[PDB]
Design a protein around this ligand. Structure first.
Ligand code: EMY
Lengths: 8, 210
């Protein structure tokens, strides 16, 4: 969830 | 890519050294949490990482984030024997602890110093952890191993350029990789220790993956 936004 | 461009690319993508402020946990959470934000940006700059899917990048970082944090702490603590340099202002001794995991970090730090590990080899070992920790957990898998083979070619190149013979290049490459098995064991026990501490929103997400 959160981790995706960081790599996005 | 070259064997030289691989090192310079990893050398240029190195994250900075951050600073710190029941009591000990407080400094370590904020340190880890802020330290991962730079590890996410460093991972994106590792050759071949961005070629993978968004889900693959997430999984690779879900299971290797604490391994990379520990090998980084060991690297900057390598020249402070019997101590661990969590931050320039947070240099702690073996009695300021947990201690079971503390002693393992020191043994690894004392082992890298025994081998006189170089920075060029450190950035390679750190990238291998990011790509190998979750590869065993179809066309994308062959690409990860293709990059891993390139990093292996880079490690040997660094050893050959250092004057080592073939027997010594293979021996050093084996000694370096065998330590990753211990670094993974440290993260396994460190995940159980932080899961027995029940932090940060970004952290907790990393805590639910294991
Ligand atoms: O539960 C423990 C650790 C933990 C802290 C944060 C998130 C998940 C687990 S114990 C323990 C953790 C640790 N260093 C790991 C570390 C390295 C660099 C850094 O910036 C922050 C932490 N070292 C020792 Cl000796 N003991």
């Amino acid at each position: 969830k959160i981790l995706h936004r960081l790599l996005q | 890519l070259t064997a030289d461009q691989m090192v310079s690319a990893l050398l240029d993508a190195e994250p900075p050294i951050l600073y710190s402020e029941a009591s000990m946990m407080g400094l370590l959470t904020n340190l880890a949490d802020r330290e991962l934000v730079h590890m996410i940006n460093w991972a994106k700059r590792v050759p071949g990482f961005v070629d993978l899917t968004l889900h693959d990048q997430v999984h690779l970082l879900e299971c290797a984030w604490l391994e990379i944090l520990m090998i980084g702490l060991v690297w900057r603590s390598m020249e402070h024997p019997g101590k661990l340099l969590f931050a320039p202002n947070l240099l702690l001794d073996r009695n300021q602890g947990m201690v079971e995991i503390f002693d393992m970090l020191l043994a690894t730090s004392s082992r890298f110093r025994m081998m006189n590990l170089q920075g060029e080899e450190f950035v390679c070992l750190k990238s291998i952890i990011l790509l190998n920790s979750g590869v065993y957990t179809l066309e994308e898998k062959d690409h990860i191993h293709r990059v891993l083979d390139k990093i292996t070619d880079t490690l040997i190149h660094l050893m050959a350029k250092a004057g080592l013979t073939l027997q010594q290049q293979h021996q050093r490459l084996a000694q370096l990789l065998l330590i990753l098995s211990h670094i993974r064991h440290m993260s396994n026990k460190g995940m159980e220790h932080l899961y027995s501490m029940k932090l940060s929103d970004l952290l907790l997400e990393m805590l639910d993956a294991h």
